[PDB]
Design a protein around this ligand. Sequence first.
Ligand code: BCL
Ligand code: BCL
Ligand code: BCL
Ligand code: BCL
Ligand code: BCL
Ligand SMILES: CC[C@H]1c2cc3[nH]c4c(c3C)C(=O)[C@H](C(=O)OC)c4c3nc(cc4[nH]c(cc(n2)[C@@H]1C)c(C(C)=O)c4C)[C@@H](C)[C@@H]3CCC(=O)OC/C=C(\C)CCC[C@H](C)CCC[C@H](C)CCCC(C)C
Ligand code: HEC
Ligand code: HEC
Ligand SMILES: COC(C)(C)C(=O)/C=C/C(C)=C/C=C/C(C)=C/C=C/C(C)=C/C=C/C=C(C)/C=C/C=C(\C)CC/C=C(\C)CCC=C(C)C
Ligand SMILES: COC(C)(C)C(=O)/C=C/C(C)=C/C=C/C(C)=C/C=C/C(C)=C/C=C\C=C(C)\C=C\C=C(/C)CC/C=C(\C)CCC=C(C)C
Ligand SMILES: [Fe+3]
Lengths: 44, 44, 52, 52, 52, 52, 51, 50, 256, 325, 274, 103, 52
Amino acid sequence: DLSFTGLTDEQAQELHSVYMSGLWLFSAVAVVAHLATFIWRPWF
Amino acid sequence: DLSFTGLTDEQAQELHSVYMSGLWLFSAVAVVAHLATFIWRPWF
Amino acid sequence: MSKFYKIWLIFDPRRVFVAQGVFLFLLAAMIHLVLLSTEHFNWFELAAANAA
Amino acid sequence: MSKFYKIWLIFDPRRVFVAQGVFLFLLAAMIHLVLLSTEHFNWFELAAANAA
Amino acid sequence: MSKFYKIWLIFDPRRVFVAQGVFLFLLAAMIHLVLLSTEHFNWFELAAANAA
Amino acid sequence: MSKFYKIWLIFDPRRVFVAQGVFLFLLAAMIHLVLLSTEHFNWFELAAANAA
Amino acid sequence: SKFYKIWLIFDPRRVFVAQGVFLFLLAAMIHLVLLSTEHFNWFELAAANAA
Amino acid sequence: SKFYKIWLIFDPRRVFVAQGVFLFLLAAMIHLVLLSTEHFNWFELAAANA
Amino acid sequence: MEETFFGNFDLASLSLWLFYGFFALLIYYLQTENMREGYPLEDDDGNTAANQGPFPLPKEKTFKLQHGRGELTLPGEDVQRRDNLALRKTAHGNGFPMEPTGDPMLDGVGPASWSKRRDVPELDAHGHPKIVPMSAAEGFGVSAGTDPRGLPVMAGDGEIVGLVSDMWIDEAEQLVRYLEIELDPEWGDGKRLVQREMVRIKSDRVKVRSIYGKHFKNVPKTKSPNQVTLLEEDKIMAYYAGGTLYADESRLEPQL
Amino acid sequence: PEYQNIFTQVQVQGPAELGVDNENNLTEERTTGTGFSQLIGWIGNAQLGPIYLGWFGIISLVTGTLWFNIVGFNMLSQVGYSIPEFIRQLFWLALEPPSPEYGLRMPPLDDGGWFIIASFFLLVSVISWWLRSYQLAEMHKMGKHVAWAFAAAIWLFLVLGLFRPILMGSWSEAVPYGIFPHLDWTTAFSIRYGNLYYNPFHALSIVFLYGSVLLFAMHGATILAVTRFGGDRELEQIYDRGTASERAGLFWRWTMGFNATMEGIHRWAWWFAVLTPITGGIGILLTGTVVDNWFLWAVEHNFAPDYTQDYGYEAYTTYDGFLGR
Amino acid sequence: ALLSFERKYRVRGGTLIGGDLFDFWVGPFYVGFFGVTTAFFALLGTILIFWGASQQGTFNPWLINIAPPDLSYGLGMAPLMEGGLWQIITICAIGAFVSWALREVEICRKLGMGYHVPFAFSVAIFAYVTLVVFRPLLMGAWGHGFPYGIWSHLDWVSNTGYAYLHFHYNPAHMIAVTFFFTTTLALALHGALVLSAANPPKGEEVKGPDNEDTFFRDFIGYSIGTLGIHRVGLLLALNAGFWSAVCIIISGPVWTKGWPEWWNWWLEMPIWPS
Amino acid sequence: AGHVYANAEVGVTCFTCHRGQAVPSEVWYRIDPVTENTSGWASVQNRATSLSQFTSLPSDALYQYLLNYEQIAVHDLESRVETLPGDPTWQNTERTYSLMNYF
Amino acid sequence: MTCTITCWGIGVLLGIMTTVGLMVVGWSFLQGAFMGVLAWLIVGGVLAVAVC
Ligand code: BCL
Ligand code: BCL
Ligand code: BCL
Ligand code: BCL
Ligand code: BCL
Ligand SMILES: CC[C@H]1c2cc3[nH]c4c(c3C)C(=O)[C@H](C(=O)OC)c4c3nc(cc4[nH]c(cc(n2)[C@@H]1C)c(C(C)=O)c4C)[C@@H](C)[C@@H]3CCC(=O)OC/C=C(\C)CCC[C@H](C)CCC[C@H](C)CCCC(C)C
Ligand code: HEC
Ligand code: HEC
Ligand SMILES: COC(C)(C)C(=O)/C=C/C(C)=C/C=C/C(C)=C/C=C/C(C)=C/C=C/C=C(C)/C=C/C=C(\C)CC/C=C(\C)CCC=C(C)C
Ligand SMILES: COC(C)(C)C(=O)/C=C/C(C)=C/C=C/C(C)=C/C=C/C(C)=C/C=C\C=C(C)\C=C\C=C(/C)CC/C=C(\C)CCC=C(C)C
Ligand SMILES: [Fe+3]
């Protein structure tokens, strides 16, 4: 099993789930932020 | 069960609880500070 | 797809997170600075103009 | 989202807090200097202006 | 070809992904900057022009 | 909350005390200087102005 | 017919990265060559066709 | 003739990389010279015909 | 020459971009040539690091060593690595300093750390040992400056440990490399070497501020009194510089 | 304080070291007389070594003196053989290049004809010296890096006086042989062709010239910092690295994130030094021949800064105010 | 990560004002108390440059220009968009440079090596310090510092150079330049010596210090030695940095007139038979 | 009046240049053959004379420009131009530099 | 050293004396300094060679 960082198959799977959960939370805030800016001053 | 820093889940949960408690308190003061400035001079 | 988790078998999570933390803030800063360069989206000058 | 505490399983608290502490003060000085640069939000100029 | 997978027997996945990651962003940033240079596709003045 | 005392479990009290002592004085000196730079908040010049 | 013997001389790792940057620089150079030209400048044409 | 003995003199690896760089630089130089010329600039000529 | 091709891209622009491509290749060549030592990278646990940087290791180059010392290939298997280091990590992660388990100066871990060089003396062009005592030198003598032979040696804390017996000179390049210290029975026994670059010579005495009086008895010795091997040479020099941080806690602890 | 290895505190002198020699048999053309100087020994080797009297060196020395003398006697003839005036105006006199109205044709002796003769002898001496460096490295079975590094200096040397004047259509483009006059030429060259600040190859050469001084302060201090670990013996550290190479590397790895080897440092050191005249030679070669105004070249290529403030002193002060009245 | 030999040298201690609080490494870099201040000052100065670039209207690296205030403002603080930002970046630059030099002290103290490098950097800092804070004070206006632009600070050198009528005749500039050329000359020859000795023609043994020592003995008749070249080279570069500081600190506040006219002392002496 | 009355109404009088002496100071003559055994451009510049401002720049700049209406501009008005014979060279720039140094 | 350093010190003192000695009888500081510097090189070198 290929693993350059020493993480196991299950270890990376669990780490990605939390990282992706954080990515969606960060994106969700940005999406709400963009809508508020678009309403305040649209760029299209 | 990876732990690069050698911290158990119980140790990290206790440590993250205080960090978020500080993070909310730091952001709570910032929200009040931002609220006062918006009343003073709004930027929208 | 569902097998994107294998990026952590290639990349160290410690070094990526600091790399993206630096990258995201720099991107967040330069987008903000680009907006302030434009006269239309400079919210600091718009507030001054609105006060008149 | 509820598993965000795992950031401390990969980042040493006494190694990221220095980064976290520096970054916040870097911001706190950055926006304060940006506000002072703007003519509308320079609270030092406004006190002089309000004094006529 | 169905045998393109052998490129990873030649190239180290770690170096390629880092090189591809920086290349893709620099590609994306440059093309975005080229649009900002042109008058027709610069959406910042287009927003100003539309607002009249 | 009330468990902020754990900061000393990860940060040495001796080094933090010295570091903040330098930081606090440098903060105090800097803010006193920006007050002196501004004409309105320069308490030294105001005495001359009130002297007439 | 037997050009495959080039890899017996050239290192595939060094050649593949060599043309990887070379081929991109071909695209960058030719694209900017067109952009300098007033005729094959799709950015200027879109402004021109906008009228 | 029997020019195949040039490879007994020159290292094939050392001469192929030199030839490859030389061939492209020569091709780019000749192409760029035509662009400078007014008669053979196919970009300018295409605009003229349009 | 004086006319431009495709825009404002003239011959000066063509030369500029040609140099840009050459410089990028040069930086790749220059950076890779520095990867012949210390690579591949490792972590604090000793395992191979997951990240090796954007520059691959170069092709193996060979040095034809002189005086029949065989050949030498730099990239791969550094023979200078030390096996049993008396250190253990202060953190479970990476990026944190090591704390020596025992005596830092005796074990040679911090500034006192040496490198496992060859256990043979360095040779000049003639094949003779490069560094020899001036007593064994044929026609060498002090030409200028203060001669430290016979001057008492004063340690960092001010203790007098002995007098200089001889200086180990570099007859190939004609300069002093060491001073021999004949330790008093109180402060040790035998003779020890101190490099000239770590010693300061005054009018009446000669002093080293890096090592206290009690640490001279533990200075690494030489197997033979007529020559010093690169291993002993590295151990001796490292020990004195290790005292700049380990002579007392005041040096290791913050100065402010 | 700790002994900084700037001046040796004690120096020893033994029998003079002649050389290493091999079957190339360099001894016959090598001088048998050496001297020792303690004043220079405080900072370096105290032995004044013996010249190798090769034919490339002798020809370079003889023809170099011929160029030096020819320029000298024309300088002495400038002031009419008045030695006190010659000494007084020594920094001002020169052997001026030919007038521009002669082209590549041979000009009269009083109008640059002696400049061509002196330049020809200088060219022979400079090239012969380079051949001496190439031959000496060959006879020592060493690398030709000294010859190639010297050849980079020849490139700018040849461009300044030989290559550019030939393809500029006149010998007048050469540099005058004077102390201040070649400073005047240096300034007038930049003024005539716009501003060499805006020449990218001049800027590139400046990048490597600052980098060359930067590296050799870095390398000079770093080696002196590890000289307590025998870091001055760089060659032995290349073959068998000790703590000197490791500490020097880790000093710069911990400072700027990356380092070099004890051998790779000199490859970095060599190239910035070599690139300084190579880039400058290119910039001079295509200055005037290709680009006749560098600031205008900067304007059309969009790297010349624009200033929105007024250009008059009356816009910032007044004449009476400046004088205080 | 770590080099193949870096593990042993990574020991705690050797800090000036910081302790174990900042005694850690981030990647290859070593963070200290002054690495904390370096990170803060460098980031603040860099961001403010781009903030000024945003207000300047261009982000072109060639065209970015943060300039000092007018000479009418004197030594006092100026408005941020009228030169005040340049003063703050200068303050950040001084803090970043001094902390970087002080961090290098912590690096070499931890490694047991000499303090030559931070001292050598301090000379280059002094050259910058004399250009931005020393010369303006001697003139009574912060507007004499060079602007913070890639090409704008080239215009300042050009204008300041011609502000003294053919700067080439400046005696300290004359001394400073010949140190710059000699250092590059010394760098080329020294770099060539080691590379040539270590890299002989194929099939030849590597050359030791004796072979490279005698090469310049046969080349120029004197070799300064392996140790001598590094100390003379450091002094050659430090003198170049120091005399560069002199040539600009004596320009305005010492010799307001043209630089050729300085040489009037040599042209007009009683010994010369006028 | 476009020059003497440039900023204020400050004209020129008989005292303006004479300043109380019969021969006004800072008057100049033609010393163009500055150095011997020379001709052309080599004969006017390689010396520190009264007209050259303590430099090795040409001393004939005053004669050629302020008396003979010679062209003072030496720059090229385009980035790349066909450098043809008769165009100003660095010698002419050096002479213009000599004149303008006197300014 | 010692003797050589002292002999150099005598020269620089003599150089300073000649710098001000010629200033008294006329000359200028720069003209006097050159003679003073020249004196320091000559008598300083001669003393460092003959006396020592
Ligand atoms: C424009 C209108 C207002 C303005 C609007 C705002 C608004 C709105 C806000 C601020 C905020 C802040 N403003 Mg303001 N501000 C203005 C003018 C000023 C002036 C002044 C002299 O004029 C000052 C001094 C400040 C100062 C401040 C800071 C108190 C604060 C940002 C904290 C930060 O950057 O670093 C903090 C980062 C650190 C990490 C510093 C670390 C240093 C310390 C000493 C480290 C000690 C740690 C040690 C281990 C001990 C730990 C113990 C813990 C208790 C466990 N403002 C103008 C007048 N200002 C922002 C804020 O954060 O409020 C909370 C905020 O939201
Ligand atoms: C133009 C109209 C609005 C505007 C519209 C928007 C919009 C729209 C957006 C922003 C976004 C942002 N804006 Mg804005 N913005 C404006 C004006 C401002 C002003 C100001 C003073 O005027 C400020 C301060 C900001 C600031 C911000 C940030 C909140 C945010 C950028 C994050 C980023 O780039 O870094 C990223 C940061 C990092 C990755 C590093 C984080 C550093 C921490 C301390 C690292 C320590 C982590 C440690 C390990 C602990 C981790 C624990 C976790 C819980 C696991 N904006 C104007 C007024 N702004 C963008 C955004 O990101 O929103 C989310 C966004 O989408
Ligand atoms: C206005 C449009 C421009 C144009 C825009 C681009 C752009 C943009 C790009 C290229 C790229 C390339 N172009 Mg094109 N290209 C044009 C005209 C030409 C002509 C020509 C004689 O006119 C030729 C020979 C080429 C050749 C090429 C190769 C260098 C390359 C394609 C991949 C390759 O290497 O395959 C190897 C070649 C072979 C093995 C055979 C395949 C033949 C090629 C692909 C077909 C081109 C032949 C051409 C159609 C002949 C036209 C003549 C007809 C008889 C009328 N182009 C016109 C003038 N071209 C790409 C590149 O990589 O650049 C580095 C790129 O990004
Ligand atoms: C107003 C003046 C112009 C100016 C006009 C020029 C001109 C003109 C030139 C430079 C060039 C150079 N300039 Mg510029 N330059 C200016 C402002 C600057 C500034 C500054 C801070 O302002 C700097 C740092 C520089 C820096 C430099 C260097 C990067 C470069 C020369 C490198 C060199 O030594 O080559 C090394 C080579 C030589 C010096 C000659 C080699 C000598 C030969 C090989 C040795 C023969 C020895 C001889 C026979 C005597 C022997 C005697 C012995 C005792 C026995 N310039 C302004 C814009 N600059 C050069 C260049 O363009 O490079 C691209 C050049 O020609
Ligand atoms: C018309 C112009 C005049 C002229 C006018 C001037 C003027 C005016 C000046 C010089 C100065 C110099 N001139 Mg001059 N000069 C002329 C012609 C020349 C020629 C030539 C061949 O013609 C040469 C070689 C020189 C040579 C030089 C050097 C003596 C010096 C350059 C600065 C220096 O030493 O570093 C000194 C600067 C420093 C060492 C910078 C310190 C850097 C800091 C500490 C670190 C930077 C970190 C930074 C943040 C980057 C980090 C970012 C990345 C993370 C890495 N001049 C022309 C004729 N010259 C300059 C000088 O002396 O400055 C002192 C000066 O002001
Ligand atoms: C001073 C003597 C000579 C010298 C020596 C020298 N320089 C040195 C050293 C030494 C010995 C180091 O140890 C140190 C180092 O680590 O180098 C890798 C360094 C160094 N000198 C450097 C550059 C440099 N040296 C130069 C020259 C010289 N180097 C001199 C000739 C030059 C010139 C004149 O061109 C430059 C540009 C760096 C590579 C490094 C200093 C690194 C540093 O300070 O890092 C901390 C700061 C940052 C990462 C960024 C700070 C940003 C600021 C807060 C804002 C911007 C300020 C700046 C004034 C703006 C400039 C705008 C435009 C003018 C471009
Ligand atoms: C008869 C003497 C005379 C001559 C000859 C002369 N000037 Fe003037 N110049 C004046 C006067 C009178 C003024 C005052 C105008 C004023 O500033 O209102 C003046 C002012 C100036 C100004 C304007 C200064 C200012 O404060 O704006 C400049 C510049 C100038 N001169 C340059 C020159 C140059 C260059 C020459 C040589 C070609 C020259 N002058 C020759 C008489 C002369
Ligand atoms: C621009 C300054 C200028 C002005 C205006 C000017 N002159 Fe002159 N004058 C000169 C010059 C130049 C000379 C030539 C030097 C010489 O002849 O000694 C000269 C020569 C003379 C001479 C000859 C001096 C001698 O050597 O015998 C006289 C007489 C003279 N001026 C009278 C006057 C008078 C009267 C006025 C007032 C109306 C006046 N000038 C104003 C510039 C001027
Ligand atoms: C240029 O552009 C313009 C437009 C100008 C601009 O403004 C751009 C602005 C941009 C881009 C904004 C970028 C800002 C961002 C992203 C905001 C990050 C800010 C964050 C994330 C806030 C963290 C707060 C955390 C704290 C403060 C915790 C407190 C910690 C407490 C106090 C102590 C911790 C606990 C312990 C020590 C105990 C545990 C220990 C044991 C149990 C042992
Ligand atoms: C007691 O002493 C007595 C005896 C009196 C004496 O003599 C003293 C001598 C005295 C004081 C002279 C002192 C000389 C001085 C200060 C001059 C400095 C010199 C300087 C600064 C040189 C700058 C320019 C150098 C270049 C750049 C050359 C370019 C050369 C080119 C490359 C040559 C190319 C070749 C040709 C053009 C020939 C072509 C023809 C054929 C090939 C046929
Ligand atoms: Fe070296």
